[PDB]
Design a protein around this ligand. Structure first.
Ligand code: 6E8
Ligand code: MN
Length: 305
């Protein structure tokens, strides 16, 4: 009855030579990675961009997430009122997040095995006897708060040691984002234990790339694009009737589904733990979902080839 972890997605460890151009590298690994939907890329050991967000002034109001909101829908008094959220700094959010996780598991946050957090996450999502509520930061533009990468924009100070990172093609501010036609900037994610995102693809079936600047790992699940329609059919068969008819862009706001359910219906699913300093790439029309193991900070952008 415990969750069965999907097989691991490919992890690549490029040489310095392979690491010069991200689009060339992604094009070369595509024959394998597009068959798994997601892959993980570990930069060379010495590639360590400094964290460039203005942490002192970094303030944000997280949103609240109830893990079992869908299963709970199987009329509670005064529904719609979450209590409420307050404004945090990055530091005070992290204090809240660590206290939550260490209290939840009764152990220091870094001693909780990633497989236990995963098993407990999926138990909680389906449990009606236990309502767990977490908070996270998303819908956070790097244009308002600053990028996690140094940028030669004249707004902060680049040190000489930072300049190579401001100019690197793996700096997500330097990824190509313009689609060709006859006719964006990176976003930031502040996670805590159990905060999660449900199954979705990107607009225009775009690639996406995500960098975990620091913190505890981010656990991902990915489905290759060749199984996109099978995943959509399982969702339709098993989603609530009230939401079955909804357009994809709205339905993707509530498409939470245990990976084992998809696997039981023949949908291939792969997993990974993205750790600090690692990239995850999602391929075009590769459904993905995931959750955070603890307090962390990621940056992501949709790019075009
Ligand atoms: C909403 C959301 N989406 C994503 C993606 C994607 N795609 C990757 N990480 N990630 C997140 O951590 C969050 C929240 C929980 C902080
Ligand atoms: Mn995504």
């Amino acid at each position: 009855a415990e969750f069965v972890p999907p097989p691991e997605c490919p992890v690549f460890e490029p040489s310095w030579e392979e690491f010069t151009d991200p689009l060339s590298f992604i094009g070369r690994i595509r024959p394998l990675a597009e068959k798994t939907g997601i892959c993980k890329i570990r930069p060379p050991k010495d590639w360590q961009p400094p964290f460039a967000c203005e942490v002192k002034s970094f303030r944000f109001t997280p949103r609240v997430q109830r893990l079992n909101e869908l299963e709970a829908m199987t009329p509670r008094e005064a529904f719609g009122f979450e209590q409420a959220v307050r404004e945090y700094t990055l530091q005070s959010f992290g204090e809240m997040a660590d206290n939550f996780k260490s209290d939840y598991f009764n152990m220091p946050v870094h001693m909780v095995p990633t497989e236990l957090v995963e098993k407990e996450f999926w138990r909680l999502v389906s449990s009606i006897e236990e309502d767990v509520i977490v908070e996270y930061g998303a819908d956070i533009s790097s244009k308002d708060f600053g990028s996690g990468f140094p940028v030669k924009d004249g707004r902060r100070k680049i040190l000489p040691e930072e300049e190579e990172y401001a100019l690197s093609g793996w700096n997500l501010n330097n990824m190509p984002v313009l689609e060709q036609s006859v006719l964006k900037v990176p976003w930031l994610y502040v996670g805590m234990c159990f905060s999660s995102f449900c199954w979705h693809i990107e607009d225009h079936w775009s690639y996406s790339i995500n960098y975990l600047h620091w913190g505890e790992p981010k656990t991902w699940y990915g489905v290759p694009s060749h199984a996109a329609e099978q995943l959509e059919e399982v969702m339709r068969e098993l989603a609530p009737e009230l939401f079955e008819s909804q357009p994809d862009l709205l339905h993707q706001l509530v498409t939470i589904m245990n990976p084992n359910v998809l696997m039981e219906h023949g949908v291939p699913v792969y997993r990974t733990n993205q750790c600090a300093g690692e990239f995850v790439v999602t391929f075009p029309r590769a459904y993905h979902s995931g959750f955070n193991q603890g307090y962390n900070f990621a940056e992501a952008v949709n790019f075009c080839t």
